[PDB]
């Protein structure tokens, strides 16, 4: 009963993506997906994701999260796909022919915001998400409004969209 | 992400409680981490944690009071070694750790009341 | 009339629970009746009842599982003889029976969990 | 911290009260007092009070209530006071010099509604109430509005006023 992944034709690709300008820390200002669910009783804390450029053009992707009495860092590798602005998992081959993972930078101005699309496809299910990053913990209202419209255009109702609450713990380190 | 769990469970005379924490379908590739937090007298402590793939037996730290299995969109947990002083609200935190994007859900918790057995 | 009582009480190993049901000041002349109702599996039964004047020891039916005292704006109750099968929500109904006008209040109830002792 | 009883000068007395027209069943459509508290989570069921006239001019006062798996009847005696329309308890003398009880019929048309005032005075406290009875379980909106204004005029906030919910169990017997 999970909302199906939208056709990739509805997900724009940032033109002439510049990897040497996209590196750095990006705060998660907005997050939507077929598994995301807004609950005012359980607001989500904001976290950050750092894109560290490697010599081979892939990115080390570090997410900084504020956990119970400590800060944590997750690690992932985004390997360049067929087009600039697209990537796949560094260990995707270890999942099998039926599993695929796509990262697509939808739109970014490198120094203010970035909209990224994620799609994990498996034999009998697809999980996709859209996130809007900010170089700061806050973004102009219009940018967030466009994010909501874009999310809906992908078949996501408004309650499948959350805006993490800004925090000072661990995400600024 | 909505995380469901029983509101109340009474620990057995042997100090054991078994309940389920359900959440959104994780899929097969997603690495999930479940963390059990104990809230009592406004204080919060981490009881146990395990990272797993859907459908596997969970591996908690050695000498841990938690054991369980993952099936479908839920974790089937058993917490043992409980004593009256351990009475409290046991909250399930379920995180989608890998691959990106990081996301999570937190349950309202399962209140576990513990009564110590009689000295006979 | 607001009737306050503890949300949860665990019966002792001897099957006993003691709690307070507070309500509006009754005064000295007003005849008050407290009725304890047990709600379980959507079924409601009357456990015990007593009519009294403020400040007196309560008189429940003979062989009744309830005992208590009245002090100020509250009744201090003790319910004994409880067994696991008696687990349920114990609601206090407090009525101003005399003199007119008839009026009352009903509490949200005290959930009493009962665990039967080990055969030793 | 109980709202004090208002001065009797603020409580009208039905003029030329007719006891031989006031007998019968009266449904409790409204009830207010310094001990009454409206709680939408615990709505009060309607009950009825029957005034049975005795040869000595007092009334036997029977309240019919719907209890747990049964109907109940309370009993009281209203003995004529100094003025027609006023009464006291039949056993008032058994309480002591410091205790007094007054019933005053404020207003009634005998066949539609009746507004009655009750005051129980003790050494260190006073409990008073106002009730509006109906010969039927419902009364015109205006009658109830006047009851609310009258209640407030006696120093009672709106949450100290309740309108019992009509029921079919036991009160029509």
UniProtKB/Swiss-Prot annotation, chains B, C:
GO terms for cellular component: clathrin-coated endocytic vesicle; external side of plasma membrane; Golgi apparatus; perinuclear region of cytoplasm; plasma membrane; protein complex involved in cell adhesion. Residues 9-13, 113-118 are annotated as: Homodimerization. Disulfide bonds join 21-92, 48-66. The keyword Chloroplast does not apply. Widely expressed with highest levels in lymphoid tissues. Detected in activated T-cells where expression levels are 30- to 50-fold less than CD28, the stimulatory coreceptor, on the cell surface following activation. It comes from the Eukaryota. Glycans are attached at residues 76, 108. It is a single-pass type I membrane protein. The therapeutic antibody Ipilimumab competes for the binding site of the endogenous ligands CD80/B7-1, CD86/B7-2 and ICOSLG. This is Cytotoxic T-lymphocyte protein 4. The lineage of its organism: Eukaryota, Metazoa, Chordata, Craniata, Vertebrata. The chain holds residues 38 to 157 of 223 of the full protein.
């Amino acid at each position: 009963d999970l909302i199906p992944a939208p056709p990739l034709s509805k997900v724009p690709l940032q033109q002439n993506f510049q990897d040497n300008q996209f590196h750095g820390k990006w705060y998660v200002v907005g997050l939507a997906g077929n598994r995301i669910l807004r609950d005012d009783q359980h607001p989500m804390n904001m976290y950050a994701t750092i894109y560290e450029l490697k010599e081979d053009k892939s990115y080390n992707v570090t997410s900084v999260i504020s956990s119970h009495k400590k800060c944590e860092y997750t690690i992932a590798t985004f390997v360049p796909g067929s087009q600039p602005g697209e990537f796949t998992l560094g260990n995707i081959k270890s999942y099998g022919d039926k599993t695929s993972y796509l990262v697509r930078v939808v739109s970014t101005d490198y120094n203010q915001y970035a909209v990224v699309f994620f799609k994990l496809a498996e034999d009998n299910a697809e999980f996709f998400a859209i996130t809007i990053y900010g170089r700061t913990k806050e973004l102009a209202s219009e940018l967030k409004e466009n994010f909501i419209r874009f999310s809906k255009s992908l078949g996501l109702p408004e309650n499948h969209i959350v805006f993490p609450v800004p925090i000072d713990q661990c995400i600024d380190g | 992400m909505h995380v469901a769990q029983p509101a109340v469970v009474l620990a057995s005379s042997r100090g054991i409680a078994s309940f389920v924490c359900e959440y959104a379908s994780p899929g097969k590739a997603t690495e999930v981490r479940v963390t059990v937090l104990r809230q009592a007298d406004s204080q919060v402590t981490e009881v146990c944690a395990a990272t797993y793939m859907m459908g596997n037996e969970l591996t908690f730290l050695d000498d841990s009071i938690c054991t369980g299995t993952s099936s479908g969109n839920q974790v089937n947990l058993t917490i043992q070694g409980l004593r009256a002083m351990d009475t409290g609200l046991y909250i399930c935190k379920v995180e989608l750790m890998y691959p990106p994007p990081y996301y999570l859900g937190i349950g309202n918790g399962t209140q576990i009341y513990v009564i110590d057995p009689e000295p006979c």
